[PDB]
Design a protein around this nucleic acid. Sequence first.
RNA 1: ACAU
DNA 2: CGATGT
Length: 135
Amino acid sequence: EEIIWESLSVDVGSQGNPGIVEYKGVDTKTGEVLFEREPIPIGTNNMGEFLAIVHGLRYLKERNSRKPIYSDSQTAIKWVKDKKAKSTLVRNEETALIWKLVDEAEEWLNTHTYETPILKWQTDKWGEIKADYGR
RNA sequence: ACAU
DNA sequence: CGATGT
Ligand SMILES: [Cl-]
Ligand SMILES: [Cl-]
Ligand SMILES: [Cl-]
Ligand SMILES: [Mg+2]
Ligand SMILES: [Mg+2]
Ligand SMILES: [Rb+]
Ligand SMILES: [Rb+]
Ligand SMILES: [Rb+]
């Protein structure tokens, strides 16, 4: 119903899907960029959306912040809830980096606690998420 | 169908 | 138009 402005918003950007994947997190209220992942040569949209949420969890935990995280990705929200990224991307030499990051993200979720609410950004009502790449 |  | 996902 109402945007929770006191929050972190995350999003993926890609060149191809699968293709080059990056992600960032912004302060929902101001658009200030709070973190940005160096581009990963091959990944999927959903792997990037997942990594962005997990990085947000880690970022807020390190800072003792109870703010929620917004993502527009139904898939990634579910993967984080399950602590399992059910990607179809082939595991081979050229996808090794993205899969290492995804594996490490799951490992972190399995060994740490958090209360951060992970909320669906309602694009149809609110427009593009504030972390969007505009591409 | 919905979300990207 | 293609691809990633529930
Ligand atoms: Cl990552
Ligand atoms: Cl909340
Ligand atoms: Cl959701
Ligand atoms: Mg998105
Ligand atoms: Mg976007
Ligand atoms: Rb902490
Ligand atoms: Rb975009
Ligand atoms: Rb589809």
